[PDB]
mmCIF file of C-alpha atoms and ligand atoms in Angstrom:
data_model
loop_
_atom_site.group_PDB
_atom_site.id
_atom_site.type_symbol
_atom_site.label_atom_id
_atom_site.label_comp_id
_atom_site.label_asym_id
_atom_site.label_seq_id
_atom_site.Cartn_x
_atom_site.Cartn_y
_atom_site.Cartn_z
ATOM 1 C CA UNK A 1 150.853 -34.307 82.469
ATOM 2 C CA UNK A 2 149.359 -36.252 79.169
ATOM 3 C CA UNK A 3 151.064 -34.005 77.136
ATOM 4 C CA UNK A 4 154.893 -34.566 78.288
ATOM 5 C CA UNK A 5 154.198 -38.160 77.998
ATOM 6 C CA UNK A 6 152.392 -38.031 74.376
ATOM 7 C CA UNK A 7 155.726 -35.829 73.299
ATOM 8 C CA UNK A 8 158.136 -38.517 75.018
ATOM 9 C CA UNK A 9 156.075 -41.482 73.002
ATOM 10 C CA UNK A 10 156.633 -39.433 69.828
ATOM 11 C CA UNK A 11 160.533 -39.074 70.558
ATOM 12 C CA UNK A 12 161.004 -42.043 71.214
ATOM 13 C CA UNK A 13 158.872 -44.004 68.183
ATOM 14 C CA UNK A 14 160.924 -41.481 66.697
ATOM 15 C CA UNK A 15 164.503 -43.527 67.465
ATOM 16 C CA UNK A 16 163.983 -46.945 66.655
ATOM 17 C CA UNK A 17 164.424 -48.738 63.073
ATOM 18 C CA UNK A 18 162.071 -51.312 64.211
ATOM 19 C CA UNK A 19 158.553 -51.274 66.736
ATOM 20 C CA UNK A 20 156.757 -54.343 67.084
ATOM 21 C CA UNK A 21 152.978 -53.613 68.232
ATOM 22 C CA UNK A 22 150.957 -56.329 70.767
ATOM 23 C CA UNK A 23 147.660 -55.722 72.196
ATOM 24 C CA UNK A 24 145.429 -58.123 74.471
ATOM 25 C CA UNK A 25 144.780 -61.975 73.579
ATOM 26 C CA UNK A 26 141.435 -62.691 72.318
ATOM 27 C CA UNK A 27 141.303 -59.123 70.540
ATOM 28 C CA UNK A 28 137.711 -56.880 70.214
ATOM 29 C CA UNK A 29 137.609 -53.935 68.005
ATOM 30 C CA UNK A 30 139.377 -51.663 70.489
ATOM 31 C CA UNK A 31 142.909 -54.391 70.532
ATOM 32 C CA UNK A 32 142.545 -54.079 66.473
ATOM 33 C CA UNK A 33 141.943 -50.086 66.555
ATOM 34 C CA UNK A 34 144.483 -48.811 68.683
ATOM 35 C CA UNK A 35 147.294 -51.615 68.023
ATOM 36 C CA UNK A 36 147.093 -52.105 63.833
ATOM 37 C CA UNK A 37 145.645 -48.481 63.925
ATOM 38 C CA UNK A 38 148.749 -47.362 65.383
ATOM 39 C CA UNK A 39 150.455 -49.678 62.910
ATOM 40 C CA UNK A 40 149.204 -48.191 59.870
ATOM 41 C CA UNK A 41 150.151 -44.629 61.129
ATOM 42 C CA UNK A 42 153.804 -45.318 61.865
ATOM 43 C CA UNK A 43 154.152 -47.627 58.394
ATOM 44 C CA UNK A 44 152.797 -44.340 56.453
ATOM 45 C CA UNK A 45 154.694 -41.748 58.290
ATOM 46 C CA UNK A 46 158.039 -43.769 58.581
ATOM 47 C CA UNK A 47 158.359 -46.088 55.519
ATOM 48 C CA UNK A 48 161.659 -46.629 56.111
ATOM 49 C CA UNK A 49 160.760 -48.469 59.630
ATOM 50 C CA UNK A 50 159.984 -51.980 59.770
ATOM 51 C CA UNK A 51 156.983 -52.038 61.257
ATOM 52 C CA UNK A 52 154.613 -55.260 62.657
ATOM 53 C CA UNK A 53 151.978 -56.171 64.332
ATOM 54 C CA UNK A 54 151.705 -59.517 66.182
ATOM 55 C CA UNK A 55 149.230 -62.272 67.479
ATOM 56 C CA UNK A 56 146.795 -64.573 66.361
ATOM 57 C CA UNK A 57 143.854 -63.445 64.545
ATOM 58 C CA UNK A 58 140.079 -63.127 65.377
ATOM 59 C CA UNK A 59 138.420 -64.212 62.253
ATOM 60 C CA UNK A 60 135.253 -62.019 63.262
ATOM 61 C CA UNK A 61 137.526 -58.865 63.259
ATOM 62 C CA UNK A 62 140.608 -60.361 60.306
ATOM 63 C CA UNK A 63 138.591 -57.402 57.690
ATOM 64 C CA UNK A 64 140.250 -54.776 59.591
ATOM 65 C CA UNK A 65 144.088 -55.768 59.196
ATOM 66 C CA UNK A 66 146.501 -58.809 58.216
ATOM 67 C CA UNK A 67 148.580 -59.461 61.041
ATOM 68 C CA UNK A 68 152.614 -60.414 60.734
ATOM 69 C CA UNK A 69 154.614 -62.838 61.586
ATOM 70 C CA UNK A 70 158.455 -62.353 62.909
ATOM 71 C CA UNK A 71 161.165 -64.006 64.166
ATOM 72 C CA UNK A 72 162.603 -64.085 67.488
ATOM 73 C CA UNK A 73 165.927 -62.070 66.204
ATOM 74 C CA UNK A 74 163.659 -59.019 65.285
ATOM 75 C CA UNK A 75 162.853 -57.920 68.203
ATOM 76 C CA UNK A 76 166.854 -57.666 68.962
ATOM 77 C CA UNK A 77 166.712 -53.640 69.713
ATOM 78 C CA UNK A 78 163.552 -52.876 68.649
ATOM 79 C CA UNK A 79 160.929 -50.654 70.443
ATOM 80 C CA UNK A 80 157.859 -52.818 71.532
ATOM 81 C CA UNK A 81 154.393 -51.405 71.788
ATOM 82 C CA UNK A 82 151.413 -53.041 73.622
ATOM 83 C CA UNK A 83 148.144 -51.845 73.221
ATOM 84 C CA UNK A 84 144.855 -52.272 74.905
ATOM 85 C CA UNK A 85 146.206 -54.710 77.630
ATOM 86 C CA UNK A 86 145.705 -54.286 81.880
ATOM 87 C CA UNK A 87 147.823 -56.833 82.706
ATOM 88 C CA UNK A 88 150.832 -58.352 81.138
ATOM 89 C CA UNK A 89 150.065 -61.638 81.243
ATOM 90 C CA UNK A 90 147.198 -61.551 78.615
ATOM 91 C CA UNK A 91 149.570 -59.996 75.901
ATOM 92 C CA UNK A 92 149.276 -61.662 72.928
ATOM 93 C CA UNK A 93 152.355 -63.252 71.853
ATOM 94 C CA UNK A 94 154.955 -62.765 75.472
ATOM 95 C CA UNK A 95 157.798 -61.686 73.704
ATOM 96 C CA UNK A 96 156.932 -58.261 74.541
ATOM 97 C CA UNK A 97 159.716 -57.715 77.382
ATOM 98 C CA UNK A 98 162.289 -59.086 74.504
ATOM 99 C CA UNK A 99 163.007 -55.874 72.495
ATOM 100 C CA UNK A 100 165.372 -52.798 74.129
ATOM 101 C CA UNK A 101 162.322 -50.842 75.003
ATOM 102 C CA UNK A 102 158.580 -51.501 76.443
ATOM 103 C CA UNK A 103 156.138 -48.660 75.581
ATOM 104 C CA UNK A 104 152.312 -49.521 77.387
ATOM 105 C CA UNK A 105 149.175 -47.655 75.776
ATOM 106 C CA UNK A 106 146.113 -48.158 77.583
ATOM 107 C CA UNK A 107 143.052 -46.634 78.873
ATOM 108 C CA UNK A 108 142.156 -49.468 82.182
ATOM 109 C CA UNK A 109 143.765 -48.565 85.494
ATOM 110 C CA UNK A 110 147.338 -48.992 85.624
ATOM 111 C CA UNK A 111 147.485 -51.867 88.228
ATOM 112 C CA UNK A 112 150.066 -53.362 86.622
ATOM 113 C CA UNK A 113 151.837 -50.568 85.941
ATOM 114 C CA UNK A 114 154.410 -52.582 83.762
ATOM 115 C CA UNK A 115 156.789 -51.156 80.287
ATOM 116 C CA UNK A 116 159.288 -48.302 80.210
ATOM 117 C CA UNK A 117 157.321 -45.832 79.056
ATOM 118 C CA UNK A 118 153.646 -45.760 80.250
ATOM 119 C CA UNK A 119 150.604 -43.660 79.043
ATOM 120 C CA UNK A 120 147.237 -44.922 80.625
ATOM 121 C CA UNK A 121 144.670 -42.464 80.471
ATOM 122 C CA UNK A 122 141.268 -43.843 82.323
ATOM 123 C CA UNK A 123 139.200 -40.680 81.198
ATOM 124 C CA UNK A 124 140.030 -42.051 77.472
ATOM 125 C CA UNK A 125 137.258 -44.117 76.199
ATOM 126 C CA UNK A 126 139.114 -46.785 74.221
ATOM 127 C CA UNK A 127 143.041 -47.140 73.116
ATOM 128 C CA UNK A 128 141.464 -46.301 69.766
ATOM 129 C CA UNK A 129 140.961 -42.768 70.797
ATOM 130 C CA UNK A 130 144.300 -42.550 72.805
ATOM 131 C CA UNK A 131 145.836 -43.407 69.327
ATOM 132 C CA UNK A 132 143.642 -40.795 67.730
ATOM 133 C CA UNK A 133 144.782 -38.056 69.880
ATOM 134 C CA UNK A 134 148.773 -39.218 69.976
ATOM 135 C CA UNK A 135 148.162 -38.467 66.580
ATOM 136 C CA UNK A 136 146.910 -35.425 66.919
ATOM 137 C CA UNK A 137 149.959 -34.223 68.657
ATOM 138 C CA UNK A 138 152.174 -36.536 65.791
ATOM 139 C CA UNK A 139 150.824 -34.611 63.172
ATOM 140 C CA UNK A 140 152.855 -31.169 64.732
ATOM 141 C CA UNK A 141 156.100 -34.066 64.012
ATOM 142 C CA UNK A 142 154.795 -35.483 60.457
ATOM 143 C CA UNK A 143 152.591 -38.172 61.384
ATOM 144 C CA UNK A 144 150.158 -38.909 58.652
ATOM 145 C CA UNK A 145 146.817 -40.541 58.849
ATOM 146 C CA UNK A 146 145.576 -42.089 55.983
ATOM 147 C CA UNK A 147 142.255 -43.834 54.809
ATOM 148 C CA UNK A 148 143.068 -47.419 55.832
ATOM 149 C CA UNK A 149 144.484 -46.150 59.568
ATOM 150 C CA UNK A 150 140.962 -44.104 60.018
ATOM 151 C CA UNK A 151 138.688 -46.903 59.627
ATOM 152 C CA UNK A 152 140.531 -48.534 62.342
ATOM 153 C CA UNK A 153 140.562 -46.042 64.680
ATOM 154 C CA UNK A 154 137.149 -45.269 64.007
ATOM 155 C CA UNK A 155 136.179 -49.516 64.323
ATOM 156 C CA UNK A 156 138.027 -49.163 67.648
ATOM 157 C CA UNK A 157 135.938 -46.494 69.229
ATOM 158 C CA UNK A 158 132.412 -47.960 67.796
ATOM 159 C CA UNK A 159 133.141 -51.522 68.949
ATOM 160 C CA UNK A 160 134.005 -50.271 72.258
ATOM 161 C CA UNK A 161 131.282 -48.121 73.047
ATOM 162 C CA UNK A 162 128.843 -50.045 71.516
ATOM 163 C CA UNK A 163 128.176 -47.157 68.871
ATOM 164 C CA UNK A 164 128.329 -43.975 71.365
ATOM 165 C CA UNK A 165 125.835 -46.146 73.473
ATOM 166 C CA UNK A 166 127.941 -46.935 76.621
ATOM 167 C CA UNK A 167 129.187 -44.639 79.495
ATOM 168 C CA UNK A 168 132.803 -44.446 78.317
ATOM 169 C CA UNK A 169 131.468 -42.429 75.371
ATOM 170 C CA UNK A 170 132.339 -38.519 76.064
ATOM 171 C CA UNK A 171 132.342 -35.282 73.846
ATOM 172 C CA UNK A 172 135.816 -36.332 72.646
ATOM 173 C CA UNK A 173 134.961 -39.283 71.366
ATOM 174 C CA UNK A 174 132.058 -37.629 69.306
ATOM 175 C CA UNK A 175 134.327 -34.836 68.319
ATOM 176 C CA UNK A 176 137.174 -37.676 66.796
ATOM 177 C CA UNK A 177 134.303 -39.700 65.402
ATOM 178 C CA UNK A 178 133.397 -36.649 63.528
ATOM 179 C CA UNK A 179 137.047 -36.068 62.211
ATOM 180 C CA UNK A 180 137.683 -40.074 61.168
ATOM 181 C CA UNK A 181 134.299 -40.515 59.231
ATOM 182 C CA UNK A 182 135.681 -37.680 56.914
ATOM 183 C CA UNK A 183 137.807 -40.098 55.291
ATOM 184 C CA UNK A 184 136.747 -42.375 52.260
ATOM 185 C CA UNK A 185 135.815 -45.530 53.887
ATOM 186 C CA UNK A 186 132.524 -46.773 54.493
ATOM 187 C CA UNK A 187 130.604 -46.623 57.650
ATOM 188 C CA UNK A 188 127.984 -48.471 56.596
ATOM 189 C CA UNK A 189 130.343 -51.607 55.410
ATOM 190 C CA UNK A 190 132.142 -51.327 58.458
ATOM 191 C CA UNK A 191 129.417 -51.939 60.532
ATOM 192 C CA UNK A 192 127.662 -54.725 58.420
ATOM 193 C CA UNK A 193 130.867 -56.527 58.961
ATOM 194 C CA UNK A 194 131.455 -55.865 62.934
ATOM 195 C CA UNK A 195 127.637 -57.104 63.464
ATOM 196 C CA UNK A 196 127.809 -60.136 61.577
ATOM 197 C CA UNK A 197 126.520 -62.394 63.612
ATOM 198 C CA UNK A 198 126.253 -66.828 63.387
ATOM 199 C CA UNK A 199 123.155 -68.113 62.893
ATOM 200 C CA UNK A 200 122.956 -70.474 65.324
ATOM 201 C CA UNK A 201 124.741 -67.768 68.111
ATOM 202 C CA UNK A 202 121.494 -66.145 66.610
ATOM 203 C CA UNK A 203 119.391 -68.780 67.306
ATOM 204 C CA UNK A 204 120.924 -69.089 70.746
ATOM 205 C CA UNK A 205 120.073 -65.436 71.561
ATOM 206 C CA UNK A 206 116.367 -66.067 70.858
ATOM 207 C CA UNK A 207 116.201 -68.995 73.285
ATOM 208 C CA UNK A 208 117.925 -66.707 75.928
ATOM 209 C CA UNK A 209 115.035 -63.662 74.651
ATOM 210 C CA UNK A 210 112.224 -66.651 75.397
ATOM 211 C CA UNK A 211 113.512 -67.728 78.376
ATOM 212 C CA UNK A 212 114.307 -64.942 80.555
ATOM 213 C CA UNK A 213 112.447 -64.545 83.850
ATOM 214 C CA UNK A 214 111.546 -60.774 85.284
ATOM 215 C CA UNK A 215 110.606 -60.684 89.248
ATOM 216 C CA UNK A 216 108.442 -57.991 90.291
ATOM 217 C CA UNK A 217 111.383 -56.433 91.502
ATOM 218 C CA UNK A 218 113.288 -56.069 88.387
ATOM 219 C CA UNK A 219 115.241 -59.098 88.889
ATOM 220 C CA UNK A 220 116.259 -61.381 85.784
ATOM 221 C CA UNK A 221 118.154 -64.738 84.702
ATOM 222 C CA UNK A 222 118.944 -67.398 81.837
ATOM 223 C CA UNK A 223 120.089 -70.328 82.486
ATOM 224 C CA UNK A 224 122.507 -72.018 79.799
ATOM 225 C CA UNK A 225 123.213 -76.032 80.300
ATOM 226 C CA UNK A 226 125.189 -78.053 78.563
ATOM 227 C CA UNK A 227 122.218 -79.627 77.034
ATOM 228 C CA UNK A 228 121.206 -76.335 75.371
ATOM 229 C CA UNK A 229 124.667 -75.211 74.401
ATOM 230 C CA UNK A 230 124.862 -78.752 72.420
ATOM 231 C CA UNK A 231 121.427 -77.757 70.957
ATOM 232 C CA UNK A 232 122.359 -74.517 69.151
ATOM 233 C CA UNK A 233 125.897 -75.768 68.958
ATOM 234 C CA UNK A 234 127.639 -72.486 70.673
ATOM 235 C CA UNK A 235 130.136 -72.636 73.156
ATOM 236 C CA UNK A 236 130.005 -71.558 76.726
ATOM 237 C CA UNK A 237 131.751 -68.247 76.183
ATOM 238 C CA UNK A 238 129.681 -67.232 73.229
ATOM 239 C CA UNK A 239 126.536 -67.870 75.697
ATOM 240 C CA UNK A 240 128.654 -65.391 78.133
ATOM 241 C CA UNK A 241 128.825 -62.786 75.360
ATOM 242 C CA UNK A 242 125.396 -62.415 75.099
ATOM 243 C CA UNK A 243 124.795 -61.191 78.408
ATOM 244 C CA UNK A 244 124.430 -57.712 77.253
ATOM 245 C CA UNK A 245 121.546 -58.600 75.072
ATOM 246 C CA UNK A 246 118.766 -57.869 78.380
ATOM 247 C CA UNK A 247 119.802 -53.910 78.982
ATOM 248 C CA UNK A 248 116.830 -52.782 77.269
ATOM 249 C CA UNK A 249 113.613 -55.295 78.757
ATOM 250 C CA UNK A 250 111.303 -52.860 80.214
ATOM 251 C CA UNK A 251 111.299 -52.784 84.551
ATOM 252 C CA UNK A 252 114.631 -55.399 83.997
ATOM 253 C CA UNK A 253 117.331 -53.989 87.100
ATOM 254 C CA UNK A 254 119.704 -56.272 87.498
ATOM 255 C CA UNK A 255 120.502 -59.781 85.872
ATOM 256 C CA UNK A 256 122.173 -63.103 85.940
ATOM 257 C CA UNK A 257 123.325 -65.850 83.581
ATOM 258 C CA UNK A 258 124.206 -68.873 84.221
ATOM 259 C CA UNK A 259 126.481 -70.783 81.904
ATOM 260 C CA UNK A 260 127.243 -74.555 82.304
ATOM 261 C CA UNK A 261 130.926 -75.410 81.410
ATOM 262 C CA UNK A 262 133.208 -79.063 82.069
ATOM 263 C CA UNK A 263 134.501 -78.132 85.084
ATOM 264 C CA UNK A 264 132.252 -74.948 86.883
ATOM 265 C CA UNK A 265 129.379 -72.688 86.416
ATOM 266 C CA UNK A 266 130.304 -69.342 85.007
ATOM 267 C CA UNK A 267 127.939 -66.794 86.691
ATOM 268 C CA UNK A 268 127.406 -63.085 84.687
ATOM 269 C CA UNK A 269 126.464 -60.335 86.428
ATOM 270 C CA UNK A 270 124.690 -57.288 85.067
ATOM 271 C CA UNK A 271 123.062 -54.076 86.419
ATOM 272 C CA UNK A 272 121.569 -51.250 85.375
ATOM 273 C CA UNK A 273 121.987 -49.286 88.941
ATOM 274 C CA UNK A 274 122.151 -51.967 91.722
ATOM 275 C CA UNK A 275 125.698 -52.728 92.674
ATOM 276 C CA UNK A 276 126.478 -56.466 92.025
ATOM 277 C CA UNK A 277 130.325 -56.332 92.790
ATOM 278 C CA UNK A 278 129.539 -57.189 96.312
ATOM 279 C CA UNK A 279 127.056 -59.989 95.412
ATOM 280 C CA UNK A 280 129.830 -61.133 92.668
ATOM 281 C CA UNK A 281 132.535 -61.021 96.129
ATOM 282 C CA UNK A 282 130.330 -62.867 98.349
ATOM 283 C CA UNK A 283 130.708 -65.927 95.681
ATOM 284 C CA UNK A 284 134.329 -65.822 95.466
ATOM 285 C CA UNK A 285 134.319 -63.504 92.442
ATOM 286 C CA UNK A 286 133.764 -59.726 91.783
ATOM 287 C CA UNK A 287 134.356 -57.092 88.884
ATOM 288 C CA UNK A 288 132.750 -53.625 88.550
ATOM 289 C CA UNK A 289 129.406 -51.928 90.274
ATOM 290 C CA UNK A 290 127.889 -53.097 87.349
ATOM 291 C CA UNK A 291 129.597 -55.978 85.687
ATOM 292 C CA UNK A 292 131.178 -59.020 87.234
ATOM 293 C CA UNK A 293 131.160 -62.480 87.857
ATOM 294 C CA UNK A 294 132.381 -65.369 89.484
ATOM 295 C CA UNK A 295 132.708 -69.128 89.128
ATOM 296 C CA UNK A 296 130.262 -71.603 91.463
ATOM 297 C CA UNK A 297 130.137 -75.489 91.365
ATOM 298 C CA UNK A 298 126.087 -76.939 92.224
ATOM 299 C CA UNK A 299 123.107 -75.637 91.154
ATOM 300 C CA UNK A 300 121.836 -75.397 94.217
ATOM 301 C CA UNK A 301 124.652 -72.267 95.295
ATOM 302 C CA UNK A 302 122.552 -70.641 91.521
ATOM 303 C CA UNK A 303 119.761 -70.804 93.749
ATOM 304 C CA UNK A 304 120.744 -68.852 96.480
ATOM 305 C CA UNK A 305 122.470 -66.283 94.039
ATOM 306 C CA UNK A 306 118.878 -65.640 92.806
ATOM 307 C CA UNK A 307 117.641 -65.894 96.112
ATOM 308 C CA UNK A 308 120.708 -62.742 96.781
ATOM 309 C CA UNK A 309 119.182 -61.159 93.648
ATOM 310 C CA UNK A 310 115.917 -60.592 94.503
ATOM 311 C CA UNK A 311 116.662 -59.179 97.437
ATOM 312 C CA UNK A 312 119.353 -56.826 96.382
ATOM 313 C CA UNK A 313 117.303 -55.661 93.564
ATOM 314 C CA UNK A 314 114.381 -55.525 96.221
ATOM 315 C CA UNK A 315 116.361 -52.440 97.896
HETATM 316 N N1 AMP B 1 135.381 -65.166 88.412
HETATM 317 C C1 AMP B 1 135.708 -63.872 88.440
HETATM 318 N N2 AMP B 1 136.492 -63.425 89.445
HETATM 319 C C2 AMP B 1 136.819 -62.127 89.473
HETATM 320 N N3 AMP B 1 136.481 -61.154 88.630
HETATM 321 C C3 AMP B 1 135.703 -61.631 87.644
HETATM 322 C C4 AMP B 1 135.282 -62.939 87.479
HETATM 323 N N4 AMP B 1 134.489 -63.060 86.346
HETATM 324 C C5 AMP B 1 134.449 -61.844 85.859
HETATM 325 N N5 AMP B 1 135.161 -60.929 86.594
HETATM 326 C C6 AMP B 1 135.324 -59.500 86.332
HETATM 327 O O1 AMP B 1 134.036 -58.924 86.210
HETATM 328 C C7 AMP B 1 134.031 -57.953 85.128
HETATM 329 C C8 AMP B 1 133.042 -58.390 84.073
HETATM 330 O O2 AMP B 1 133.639 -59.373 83.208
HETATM 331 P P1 AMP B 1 132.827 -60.666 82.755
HETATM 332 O O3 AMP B 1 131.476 -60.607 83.370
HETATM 333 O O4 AMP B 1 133.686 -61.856 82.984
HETATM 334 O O5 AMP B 1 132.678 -60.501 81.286
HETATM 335 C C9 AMP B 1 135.482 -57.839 84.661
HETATM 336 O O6 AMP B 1 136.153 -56.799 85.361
HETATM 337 C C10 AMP B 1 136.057 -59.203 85.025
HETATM 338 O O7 AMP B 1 137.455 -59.182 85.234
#
């Protein structure tokens, strides 16, 4: 059960003078929630522990928490924590198998069920909430949450269910969000800050908003070249991010984008209902029912994906 293995995690955080805390390269609000969120419990519960928190920074999210740096010869015994992370070759910073122990928090299925000690919990929306609730059973053993550790957790869970918006939101991750805006941060900073958004990634936005096609059938795409990514001056995976940005266009079912790098095509797939895993397969990619994508090399093979599109959406 979840509860033997949040009691071993607490034992065993318990034992060792020094934990060392990874989560996934490029980091979202979750990796910084769960991994310095944990962090910031375990330096104000156990100030006697040296405690840090590795990997490189994402400016957009550096508000939240300073990361540390540490030598090679600290993780000599120590407990190492990853956060956040599927598969262990997108840790950030690979040192992770280097201390005496490997302790894996995360809420994606565990198909690579690496670490020594594992708690993956799919029904969890976010490591952020996993965190919350491990310290919900750490309080019963003197864990402490405090105002900084909050506003982490709580950053965590709004980043990565787009603000209660997305499927992975449940009644438990209400119920915590409830709890964490108790303490004396501010929501309304917090947000201002994780919204904060480039002009010209703006800018780029509004010619995807213009240019957006909508078949009959509910069917939509944008189309990103390299001559319009050197126009706005993003890069190819901020076009990518903004693939979201079409959930709400009235009759819009499913979608594509297409965005032009060096050395491929990078194809986005989105649905509302449609399943586009299969569609995302059949061009040597694939993902979830309702998010994938894949990689293609003319744009005559983005034809026939829109060609596929229509007629899955059609049915
Ligand atoms: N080329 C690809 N091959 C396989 N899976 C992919 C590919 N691109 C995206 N995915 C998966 O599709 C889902 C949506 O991610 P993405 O659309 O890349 O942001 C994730 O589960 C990705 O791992």
């Amino acid at each position: 059960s979840m509860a033997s293995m949040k009691t071993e995690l607490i034992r065993t955080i318990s034992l060792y003078d020094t934990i060392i805390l990874h989560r996934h390269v490029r980091p979202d609000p979750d990796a910084y929630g769960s991994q310095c969120g944990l962090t910031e419990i375990l330096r104000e519960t156990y100030p006697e522990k040296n405690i840090f928190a590795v990997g490189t920074p994402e400016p957009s999210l550096s508000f939240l928490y300073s990361l540390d740096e540490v030598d090679n010869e600290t993780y000599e015994g120590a407990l190492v924590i990853v956060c956040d992370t599927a598969n262990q070759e997108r840790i950030d910073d690979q040192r992770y198998p280097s201390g005496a122990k490997l302790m894996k928090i995360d809420a994606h299925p565990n198909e690579d069920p690496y670490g020594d000690l594992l708690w993956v919990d799919t029904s969890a929306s976010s490591v952020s909430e996993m965190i919350y609730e491990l310290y919900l059973e750490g309080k019963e053993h003197g864990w402490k949450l405090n105002t900084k550790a909050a506003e982490l957790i709580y950053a965590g869970i709004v980043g990565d269910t787009g603000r209660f918006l997305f499927p992975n939101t449940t009644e438990k991750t209400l119920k915590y969000a409830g709890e964490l805006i108790q303490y004396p941060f501010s929501s309304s900073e917090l947000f201002n800050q994780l919204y904060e958004t480039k002009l010209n990634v703006v800018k780029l936005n509004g010619f995807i908003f213009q240019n957006v096609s909508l078949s009959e059938n509910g069917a939509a795409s944008v189309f990103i070249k390299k001559d319009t990514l050197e126009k706005f001056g993003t890069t190819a995976s901020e076009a990518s991010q903004l693939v979201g940005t079409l959930g709400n266009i009235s009759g819009i079912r499913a979608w594509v984008f297409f965005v032009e790098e060096d050395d491929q095509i990078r194809v986005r797939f989105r649905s509302k209902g449609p399943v586009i895993n299969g569609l995302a397969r059949k061009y040597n990619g694939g993902g979830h029912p309702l998010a994938s994508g894949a990689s293609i090399y003319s744009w005559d093979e983005a034809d026939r994906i829109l060609a596929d599109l229509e007629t899955l959406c059609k049915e």
